[PDB]
């Protein structure tokens, strides 16, 4: 699927980044708009964005009930007080639209102005949802309560001078606990008072039909050339995947992922500890092509020996000097001597009988079995055969390694013959 | 429910026909067959199921 058509260029504009707000009416369908509705007031605070709109609705229209309007207007306000009136006339004229904050981090949401072949993105400073609020009913209820209080006061014709002296007892400076203080801070009244402490800012509205709308509409564009390579946004896919998903922070417990994050001297060590029989060819693939062969050789010569072309882990590597036999409890030195004798017998002849080595090393049957099961398999009628065949190509490619291994095996055989009296 | 009943009927027909075939092919002196005939323990249904 080739991107044949519509190679739209995506431009960015910072002219109206902090001045762009997304308002939506969940109760008003997209078919009907508020273009014909005369806007009266728009009270919005810069900090803690909560806009409040005052819409004007007509009365002479047949869809409006003048009697109910007069009734609700007389209910919300006083008879002829008019000092603080929600409606100038005796009719319900203003409708209050209150806003609610959708989300805090609106940086991931942007407005996309689409033109003929180009798309301009503009960040949003905030997004609010507008809903028709019912605030005149609360004021009407408060006025009904104050009328009831006035009736309770004037229950009699003339009220004598009451002795309503405010008792002189100021609130004591009681030490408030931390829990009660936190409850006061988290109380809805405290948050409402904190939001109300910010003064309102009255702004003049301008409709879509106004020329100012068309004047400011061009500000969403950015003055720039058609094709310009951006200096940023050049991270590799790996860096992107790492930055979008940041990290949080038997002896074969370490996995391959934890294996590769280790020096080769320990990687080959734990590999020879887990397998105990490893060819050089497959070891090159396991270690990786990025590692030279000379380093792998100089490392494996310290933790392994060559037998019939195959690398076998050293006895002291599997059995530390402080450990003991899990089957018999004998010290690890005798186990290492027995394993070296087994390896020497394998270097001498490919076939080894368990009875001979058991009689020579004077070890138990289970120890001899655990020794032979590492590098040999049970072959009937002949005893045991090495698990891997002869590796001649590795010997031909590295004669000095084989020579040094044989030089070490000479002393190993000397010590074994001195100990076991072969 | 009609489909479920028809499927149950077909499966049970298969079971009964297999049981009849097994009872016909079984030779005499068979201990399960003899026990099912005498009624001491078991029945033809158990033999067909086994």
């Amino acid at each position: 699927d080739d991107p044949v058509v519509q190679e739209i260029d995506v431009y960015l504009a910072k002219s109206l980044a902090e001045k762009l707000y997304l308002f939506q009416y969940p109760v008003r369908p997209a078919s009907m708009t508020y273009d014909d509705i005369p806007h009266l007031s728009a009270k919005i605070k810069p900090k803690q964005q909560k806009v409040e709109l005052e819409m004007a609705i007509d009365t002479l229209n047949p869809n409006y009930c003048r009697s109910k309007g007069e009734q609700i207007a007389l209910n919300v306000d006083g008879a002829c007080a008019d000092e603080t009136s929600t409606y100038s006339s005796k009719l319900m004229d203003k409708q209050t639209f209150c806003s609610s904050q959708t989300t805090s981090n609106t940086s991931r949401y942007a407005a996309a102005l689409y033109r003929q072949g180009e798309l301009h993105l503009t960040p949003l400073h905030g997004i609010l949802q507008l809903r028709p609020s019912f605030s005149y009913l609360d004021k009407a209820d408060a006025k009904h309560r104050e009328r009831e209080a006035a009736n309770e006061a004037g229950d009699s014709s003339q009220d004598e001078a009451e002795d309503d002296v405010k008792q002189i007892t100021v609130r004591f400076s009681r030490p408030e606990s931390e829990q009660a203080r936190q409850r006061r801070v988290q109380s809805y009244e405290f948050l409402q008072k904190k939001h109300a402490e910010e003064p309102w800012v009255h702004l003049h509205y301008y409709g879509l039909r106004d020329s100012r709308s068309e004047h400011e509409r061009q500000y969403l564009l950015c003055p720039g050339s058609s094709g310009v390579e951006n200096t940023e946004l050049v991270k590799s896919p790996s860096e992107y995947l790492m930055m979008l998903m940041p990290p949080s922070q038997p002896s074969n417990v370490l996995s391959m992922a934890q294996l590769r994050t280790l020096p080769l001297a320990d990687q080959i060590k734990i590999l020879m500890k887990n397998v105990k029989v490893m060819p050089f060819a497959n070891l090159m693939s396991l270690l990786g092509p990025s590692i030279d062969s000379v380093a792998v050789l100089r490392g494996i010569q310290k933790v392994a020996m060559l037998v019939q072309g195959n690398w076998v882990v050293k006895s002291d590597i599997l059995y530390p000097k402080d450990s003991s036999s899990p089957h018999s409890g004998v010290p690890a030195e005798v186990l290492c001597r027995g394993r070296d004798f087994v390896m020497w017998k394998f270097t001498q002849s490919r076939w080894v009988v368990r009875k001979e080595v058991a009689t020579v090393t004077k070890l138990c049957a289970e120890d001899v079995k655990d020794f032979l099961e590492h590098m040999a398999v049970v072959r009937i009628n002949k005893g045991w055969e090495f698990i891997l065949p002869y590796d001649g190509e590795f010997i031909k490619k590295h004669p000095d390694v084989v020579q040094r291994q044989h030089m070490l095996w000479t002393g190993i055989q000397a010590k074994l013959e001195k100990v076991y009296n072969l | 429910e009609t489909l479920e009943a028809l499927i149950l009927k077909e499966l049970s027909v298969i079971r009964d026909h297999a049981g009849s075939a097994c009872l016909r092919e079984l030779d005499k002196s068979n201990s399960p067959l003899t026990m099912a005939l005498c009624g001491s323990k078991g029945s033809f249904i158990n033999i067909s199921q086994m």
């Binding site: 009907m32 869809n63 109910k68 319900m92 409708q95 028709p132 009913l137 | 027909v13 009964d16 029945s43």
Partner: protein, 107 residues
């Protein structure tokens, strides 16, 4: 049908007006007069069934055919096998031999 007012999105009810019945809201003076017929059907479910049952063809939805019942020893049969017994390890049979309307029912 549930109608809502464009002014405040509240529920609209029917109320008799000075000249014609109209949809009105209990919170705002917004009203909407009725010009022509406005209907809202429901189309409830009709009992299309006849509730006929007991036919011998539908009754013989059973497996056992051409067996030997211990009552009249005739091919026709209607067996039921039950396994809901733990005290009694073997299963349970219920045979219904009925061609001449004998009505055989036993264990």
């Amino acid at each position: 049908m549930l109608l809502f007012c464009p002014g405040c999105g509240n529920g609209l009810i029917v109320e008799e007006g000075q000249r014609c019945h109209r949809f009105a809201c209990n919170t705002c003076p917004y009203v909407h007069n009725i010009t022509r017929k406005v209907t809202n059907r429901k189309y409830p479910k009709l009992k299309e069934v006849d509730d006929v049952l007991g036919g011998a063809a539908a009754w013989e939805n059973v497996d056992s055919t051409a067996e030997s019942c211990p009552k009249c020893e005739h091919p026709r049969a209607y067996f039921m096998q039950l396994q809901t017994r733990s005290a009694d390890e073997p299963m349970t049979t219920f045979y219904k031999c009925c061609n001449a309307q004998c009505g055989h029912r036993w264990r």
